[PDB]
Amino acid sequence: DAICIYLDESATWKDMKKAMEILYKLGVKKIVVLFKYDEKLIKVAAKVLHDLGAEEAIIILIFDIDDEDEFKKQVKKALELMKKLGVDHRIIALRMTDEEKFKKLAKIAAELGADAICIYLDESATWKDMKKAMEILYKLGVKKIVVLFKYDEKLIKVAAKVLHDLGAEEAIIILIFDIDDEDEFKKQVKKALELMKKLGVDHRIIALRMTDEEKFKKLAKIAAELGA
């Protein structure tokens, strides 16, 4: 499928731009980018994607706001900027935590015009939290459910079963991998893709942390040759 660039929070916008050109060069049509809401990062992603001309790209914005009106405030500002910039596919990522908190926040993002909603599970999340989050998004009637987590075989099988149970045909799984150990990275990515294809996950994205240009190019090559 596609490849998502995850910005290392120690990465800069020049790091981001270089990761995008590398994927373009490798022949990746769907270049997805993932970061915590950042006005400057949104503007750079939009210009680079326009320069490359891959209007089949996606910006995924991570929000982590306690406050409910600060959330609406920021999600509105984010979506309107992305609208100015002609970003056709904008997704708002929400971490799970409180069940009621998750529902009101997803509702707010859906109201403001978020194209899809993404479930971002942090390492404090269980598979039971994931299932509940997915059921809440389905109940709300959101079009495309997206789930984003660190590579985990249980979470993959659970996610695949819940989507099949809800009938969520448009849903997407995005997996984040550790990168320091390149051998393990190759093994885990290989395994992830095989297992997701056995379970009929049709829309799966491999996410790569952007660190060093030399490192990123290695990982992206590996992921592409394996089938991402």
Author numbering: 1 to 228
Authors' account:
In order to assess whether the proteins fold as designed, and especially whether the ovoid β barrel curvature is maintained, we determined the 3D structure of the OT3 design by X-ray crystallography using molecular replacement with the design model. In particular, the β barrel showed excellent fidelity, exhibiting just 0.74 Å RMSD over α and β carbon atoms and mirroring closely the ovoid curvature specified in the computational design. Side chain packing in the hydrophobic regions also closely followed the designed rotamers. Especially, the close packing around A93 and A207 suggests that the placement of sterically small residues at the ovoid barrel minor face was a successful strategy. The redesigned β-α loops are free of any critical hydrogen bonding or structural interactions as in the original sTIM11, enabling their redesign and diversification. To assess the quality of the twofold symmetry design, we aligned the first repeat subunit to the second and found close agreement (0.74 Å Cα RMSD), indicating that the designed twofold symmetry is self-consistent and viable. We noticed two main points of deviation: disagreement between the fourth and eighth helices (α4 and α8, which are symmetry mates) and the design model and disagreement between the seventh helix (α7) and the design model (these can be observed in Figure 2d). However, visual inspection reveals that previous flaws with sTIM11 are eliminated in OT3, such as a cavity in the central β barrel and gaps between each of the hydrophobic clusters.
Here, we report the de novo design of a TIM barrel with ovoid (twofold) symmetry, drawing inspiration from natural beta and TIM barrels with ovoid curvature. To this end, we report the computational design and experimental validation of a de novo ovoid TIMB protein, with a completely novel syntax and sequence. The designed protein exhibits an elongated β barrel architecture with loops which are not structurally involved and a more developed hydrophobic core. In accordance with our design goals, the protein folds solubly and is highly stable.
